[PDB]
Amino acid sequence: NKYKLNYKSEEEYPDLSKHNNHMAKVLTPDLYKKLRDKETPSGFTLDDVIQTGVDNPGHPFIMTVGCVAGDEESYTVFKDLFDPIIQDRHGGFKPTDKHKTDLNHENLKGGDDLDPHYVLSSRVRTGRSIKGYTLPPHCSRGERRAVEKLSVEALNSLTGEFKGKYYPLKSMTEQEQQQLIDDHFLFDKPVSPLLLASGMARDWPDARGIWHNDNKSFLVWVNEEDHLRVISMEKGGNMKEVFRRFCVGLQKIEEIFKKAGHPFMWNEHLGYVLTCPSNLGTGLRGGVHVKLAHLSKHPKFEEILTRLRLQKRGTSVFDISNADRLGSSEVEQVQLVVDGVKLMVEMEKKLEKGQSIDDMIPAQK
Amino acid sequence: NKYKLNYKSEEEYPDLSKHNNHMAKVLTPDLYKKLRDKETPSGFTLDDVIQTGVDNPGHPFIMTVGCVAGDEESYTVFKDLFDPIIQDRHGGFKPTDKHKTDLNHENLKGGDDLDPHYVLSSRVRTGRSIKGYTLPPHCSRGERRAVEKLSVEALNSLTGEFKGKYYPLKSMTEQEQQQLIDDHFLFDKPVSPLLLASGMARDWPDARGIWHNDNKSFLVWVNEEDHLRVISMEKGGNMKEVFRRFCVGLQKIEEIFKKAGHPFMWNEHLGYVLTCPSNLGTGLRGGVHVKLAHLSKHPKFEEILTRLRLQKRGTSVFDISNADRLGSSEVEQVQLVVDGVKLMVEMEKKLEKGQSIDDMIPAQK
């Protein structure tokens, strides 16, 4: 990435011509001129935020964020870039709005145990950053190793439902690796160019690794896209339990990290901070794998997804999850999943009977 | 890449465990400790030289250099790393040896017009760096654009045998591009991980481009692996003429660049400097495409290649070229090509007749 202030702003300004990303829509020659000479306490500059957006012009059909933060201070130092990108990507969320965090699983009160004939598996995942180290697109091997070191020691101390074991990618045996492959716990070097272009793939697999509890119901990936990626999963429909395991496991790693002088990066405005702006706030994606045989063929599938504020992705089973991140707490996001997936299983149980279905007005369930 | 001097040398030292590259053989904890705090006038550090070697452990069968220079001063500033790597890769070439350059095509005197029934095409290529800008793994868009700017204006002024036209990759029409594809003049974004890991692919295709004369006998690629890549080619066997066009065209771009305050990077010890250490000296690769029907099946093909000091690669036609770069001048390298390919066509004309063949002792032809 890197700039050179001996050069004129216009000589260094990126050619964002046929680019279709949140970064390219916001950058103007002035914004670059104004912020091109700044940098974070760690040496992270604007050229470094926008690099992956200069390299990846993408496709007109879909918009990527096109930029990353290498620090907790990148969001502040370069707020004039990030601010409008955050308001756009996250539905008008202003520079002056606040993000409420809610990990009291007891507040899911009104959320349940979804139909096993339709919900194959239930799952909640989030991403965390650790205060004190820079984010993956910038962190040094020393920083990476410290994050891995701190995490492994926290995880190794966990006990009971949370007792588990760590699996470094570097010295992984074929047996240890095939297991993880058919356990769905494995990750490898990023092939995505949006990921590769921000420089977060350097030194692979130094300090990267995989941790999971003995029950294989709780998983943590270390040093991949963000310092930590945590997941609570289950076969079936007990979303309450998946969220509760998730919440309790998170609070146990969080206090160990607090005590060591390294809490999860978090601020009243952005909630939990992570490397990609589209993940700010909760970093959460709670979802299910549902059999929507008829509903998915229905003309109003897309619209019903939108009004329930959920979204889907491949796997006639779909991976449906909440679509919000900033502006709403985790209890409210996993609440919308329980609600709209309950509704959709009802709708599917009607079409099975040749009956017509009824949508709800927007933003509920 | 990047380091952090607040960290202990051992916390930042790379895990070069099962790596098989020239860099990994030379780095020791002390060498890193000693040089990790240095940097070139441009900000280029050791983490930046060795990065592509930390990322690419490679294959035990073949050795890669595993490091790059982002400056003319990287070779000096980090001489303790580069020095032994250069002596190893280039056959004992000491820190105190000198490189003689020889672009007097008249000195090819004793070199000719190779057999057209066996030599399909003749070709000489080299790489150049332009003094004043950093090398591709580090250069900014501003620097890249300046190199492109300076080159295009030099090339555009050339006339006669050398009149030509420039083709930017950025605004290339499909017609302009298919032509170049079936003209064998086209290049695109690097897929090699050794290339991608040193950061030289940033901003693609900003400031990259393709230039060729009207005769399609002279070609220059701008801002790809090195600032410039120049090639003189021809169908057939007139190696004298391919070298002469090559030498004359090079001297014409060289004087234009001298006059502007930007000569080709060159020093009495390393000859022409380029981003990869394996290319130092001449950066030259003169070669031919030869029909070696019987000789290539011969048990002593590999050995005869070695004693002639040539090497081959795919395309029963082979692409045979000189194997040396540092320690020998260009006239001596293209001389070894004319000589050994003349010898090999003779050998092939014997096997065609059921006769036995005779090798020469090492380092000649």
| Residue keyed to tokens 């308001």 | A87
| Residue keyed to tokens 């779909």 | A318
Which tokens in the block code for residue A348? Answer: 């599917």
DSSP states along A52-117: HHHH---BTTB-B-----SSSTHHHHTHHHHHHHHHHHTTS--TT--------GGGG-S--B--TT
Which tokens in the block code for residue A93? Answer: 């969320």
Same domain, A72 and A111: no
Dihedral angle computed from the Cα positions of residues A305, A310, A314 and A316, in that order, rounded to the nearest 10 degrees: -50
Q: Torsions phi, psi of A121, nearest 5?
A: -150, 150
Q: Which of A247, A222, A71 is nearest to A150 (CA)?
A: A222
Q: CA separation (Å) from B116 to A8, A198, B103, B243?
A: 53, 50, 25, 17
Contact B346, B295 (CB under 8 A): no
Same domain, B61 and B194: no
Task: Determine the 3-state secondary structure of B107 from DSSP.
Answer: helix
Alpha-carbon distance B86 to nearest alpha carbon in chain A (angstroms)? 24
First to last CA, chain A: 43
Q: Which residues of A touch B8 (CB under 8 A)?
A: 142
**Can you give the CATH number for the domain in which B44 is found?**
1.10.135.10
- Report d(CA A204, CA B161) in Å as an integer: 49
Same domain, B113 and B36: no
Same domain, B213 and B287: yes
Task: Determine the 3-state secondary structure of B322 from DSSP.
Answer: strand
Same domain, B227 and B274: yes
Comparing alpha-carbon positions, the chain B residue that sits nearest to A14 is: B141
Same domain, A60 and A188: no
DSSP states along A119-159: EEEEEEEEEE-BTTS--TTT--HHHHHHHHHHHHHHHHH--
Which of B17, B191, B202 is best to mutate for the A interface (most A CBs within 10 A)? B202
Same domain, B140 and B198: yes
- Among A48, A65, A95, residue at a domain's last position: A95
Task: Determine the 3-state secondary structure of B218 from DSSP.
Answer: strand
Asked if the C-beta of A141 comes within 8 angstroms of chain B's C-beta atoms, the answer is yes
**C-beta atoms of A142 and B8 within 8 A:** yes
Asked if the C-beta of B206 comes within 8 angstroms of chain A's C-beta atoms, the answer is yes
Q: Which residues of B touch A43 (CB under 8 A)?
A: 2
Alpha-carbon distance A221 to nearest alpha carbon in chain B (angstroms)? 20
Please check if B123 is assigned to a binding site.
yes
Contact A55, A198 (CB under 8 A): no
Q: Which residues of A170-208 are buried (b: 16+ CB within 10 A; e: fewer)?
A: eebeeeeeeebeeeebbeeebeeebbbbbbbbbbbbbbb
DSSP 8-class letter at B335: H
DSSP 8-class letter at B316: -
Contact A72, A29 (CB under 8 A): no
Question: Could you tell me which residues come within 8 angstroms of residue A104 by beta carbon, excluding any fewer than 6 positions away?
Answer: A247, A331
Q: Which of B249, B141, B229 is nearest to B187 (CA)?
A: B229
Amino acid at B9: S
DSSP 8-class letter at B124: E
Contact B83, B95 (CB under 8 A): yes
**C-beta atoms of B11 and A141 within 8 A:** yes
- Indicate the helix (H) or strand (E) that contains B253: helix B239-259
Dihedral angle computed from the Cα positions of residues B302, B307, B308 and B309, in that order, rounded to the nearest 10 degrees: 90
- Report d(CA B202, CA A92) in Å as an integer: 32
Asked if the C-beta of A14 comes within 8 angstroms of chain B's C-beta atoms, the answer is yes
- Report d(CA B14, CA A140) in Å as an integer: 10
Say how many CA atoms lie within 13 Å of A192 toward its Cβ.
13
CB-based burial of residue B96 (10 Å sphere; 0-12 exposed, 13-18 middle, 19+ buried)?
Answer: exposed
Helix B330-351 vs helix B301-308: crossing angle, to nearest 10:
150
Please check if A123 is assigned to a binding site.
yes
Question: Could you tell me which residues come within 8 angstroms of residue B299 by beta carbon, excluding any fewer than 6 positions away?
Answer: none
- Among B95, B117, B135, residue at a domain's last position: B95
Same domain, B203 and B112: yes
Q: Is the peptide bond before B205 cis (omega within 30 degrees of 0)?
A: yes
- Indicate the helix (H) or strand (E) that contains A232: strand A228-235
Q: Where are the beta strands (DSSP E) in chain B?
A: 119-128, 164-168, 209-213, 218-222, 228-235, 266-267, 271-272, 285-291, 310-313, 317-322
Contact B186, B180 (CB under 8 A): yes
**C-beta atoms of B51 and A202 within 8 A:** yes
- Report d(CA B168, CA B170) in Å as an integer: 5
Q: CA separation (Å) from B99 to A153, A297, B93, B235, B288?
A: 55, 73, 9, 31, 25
Task: Point out residues after which chain A has a gap (C–N over 2.5 Å).
Answer: 315
Closest to B141 (Cβ–Cβ): which among A12, A203, A204?
A12
Distance of CA B307 to the CA centre of its chain: 22
Q: Which of B221, B213, B223, B59 is nearest to B136 (CA)?
A: B223
Q: Give A291-351 as a 3 state SS string.
A: ECCCCCCCCCHHHHHHHHCEEEECCCEEEEEECCCCCCCHHHHHHHHHHHHHHHHHHHHHH
Contact B97, B83 (CB under 8 A): no
Which tokens in the block code for residue A216? Answer: 């294989």
Q: Give A272-293 as a 3 state SS string.
A: ECCCCHHHCECCCEEEEEEECC
Same domain, A102 and A119: yes
Contact B16, B58 (CB under 8 A): no
Same domain, B215 and B251: yes
Give me the number of domains chain B comprises.
Answer: 2
Amino acid at A269: H
Q: Which of A138, A137, A194, A191 is nearest to A21 (CA)?
A: A194
Dihedral angle computed from the Cα positions of residues A88, A89, A91 and A96, in that order, rounded to the nearest 10 degrees: -70
Q: Which residues of A touch B7 (CB under 8 A)?
A: 140, 142-143
Task: Determine the 3-state secondary structure of A167 from DSSP.
Answer: strand
**Can you give the CATH number for the domain in which A250 is found?**
3.30.590.10
Which tokens in the block code for residue B296? Answer: 């290539």
First to last CA, chain B: 43
- Report d(CA B258, CA B130) in Å as an integer: 10
Q: CA separation (Å) from B255 to B251, B261, B314?
A: 6, 10, 36
- Among B95, B113, B137, residue at a domain's last position: B95
CB-based burial of residue A11 (10 Å sphere; 0-12 exposed, 13-18 middle, 19+ buried)?
Answer: middle
- Report d(CA A220, CA A208) in Å as an integer: 11
Residue B252 falls in which region: left (phi positive, over 0), alpha (psi -120 to 50) or beta: alpha
Residue A252 falls in which region: left (phi positive, over 0), alpha (psi -120 to 50) or beta: alpha
Contact A320, A305 (CB under 8 A): yes
Q: Which residues of B183-208 are buried (b: 16+ CB within 10 A; e: fewer)?
A: eebbeeebeeebbbbbbbbbbbbbbb
- Report d(CA A195, CA A48) in Å as an integer: 13
* Ranges of H-type helices in B36-107: 46-55, 74-77, 79-89
**C-beta atoms of A12 and B146 within 8 A:** no
- Indicate the helix (H) or strand (E) that contains A230: strand A228-235
Q: CA separation (Å) from A293 to A187, A288, A299?
A: 31, 15, 13
Which tokens in the block code for residue B94? Answer: 């000491």
Which tokens in the block code for residue A84? Answer: 């409008």
Same domain, A72 and A212: no
Task: Determine the 3-state secondary structure of A251 from DSSP.
Answer: helix
- Report d(CA B170, CA A126) in Å as an integer: 39
- Report d(CA A11, CA A6) in Å as an integer: 10
- Report d(CA B237, CA A249) in Å as an integer: 73
Same domain, A40 and A103: no
Distance of CA B127 to the CA centre of its chain: 5
Domain hosting residue B64, numbered range: 1-95
CB atoms within 10 A of CB A57: 18
- Report d(CA B84, CA B81) in Å as an integer: 6
Contact A202, A191 (CB under 8 A): no
Helix B330-351 vs helix B239-259: crossing angle, to nearest 10:
160
- Report d(CA A106, CA B311) in Å as an integer: 72
